[PDB]
């Protein structure tokens, strides 16, 4: 609802300054979504995926802009490029691609209405 300065540190820096609260992961403050999101930074590390640090935190601190008042999701696309990359390795030690990040319910880039995200290296890209 009100922007508030990314505290997560996983997400500082990422290429957006705001997100809002709550996210769609039943967090109602930033420090709720920092110990999950927190447990994904081995595959961050590892880099399966370069993807994979912009879907999550576009996922669990989502963007918050001031002249565009609308839950704005990544795009399908991210999500699909971290998951091939990343839910490969993740299946090998036994975990599943979470359930709340199937991309299939993240809308796809040129909506007539309503926006998405995607990025360039890091550059934000709303494309709709
Ligand atoms: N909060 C939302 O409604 N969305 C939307 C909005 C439109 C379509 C799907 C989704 C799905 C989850 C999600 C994730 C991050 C930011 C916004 C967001």
Same mark, same amino acid.
């Given at each position: 609802?009100?922007?508030?300065?990314?505290?997560?540190?996983?997400?500082? $820096?990422?290429?957006?300054?705001?997100? %809002?609260?709550?996210?769609?992961?039943?967090?109602?403050?930033?420090?709720?979504?920092? &110990?999950?999101?927190?447990?994904?930074?081995?595959?961050?590390?590892?880099?399966?995926?370069?993807?994979?640090?912009?879907?999550?935190?576009?996922?669990?601190?989502?963007?918050? &802009?001031?002249? %565009?008042?609308?839950?704005?999701?990544?795009?399908?696309?991210?999500?699909?490029?971290?998951?091939?990359?990343?839910?490969?390795?993740? +299946?090998?030690? $036994?975990?599943?691609?979470?359930?709340?990040? +199937?991309?299939?319910?993240?809308?796809?880039?040129?909506?007539?209405?309503? &926006?998405?995200?995607? %990025?360039?290296?890091?550059?934000?890209?709303?494309? $709709?």
């Amino acid at each position: 609802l009100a922007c508030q300065e990314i505290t997560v540190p996983l997400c500082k $820096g990422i290429g957006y300054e705001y997100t %809002y609260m709550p996210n769609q992961f039943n967090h109602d403050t930033q420090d709720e979504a920092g &110990l999950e999101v927190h447990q994904f930074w081995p595959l961050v590390e590892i880099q399966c995926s370069p993807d994979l640090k912009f879907f999550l935190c576009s996922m669990y601190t989502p963007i918050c &802009l001031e002249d %565009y008042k609308k839950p704005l999701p990544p795009c399908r696309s991210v999500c699909e490029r971290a998951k091939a990359g990343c839910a490969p390795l993740m +299946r090998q030690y $036994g975990f599943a691609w979470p359930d709340r990040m +199937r991309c299939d319910r993240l809308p796809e880039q040129g909506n007539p209405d309503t &926006l998405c995200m995607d %990025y360039e290296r890091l550059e934000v890209l709303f494309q $709709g």
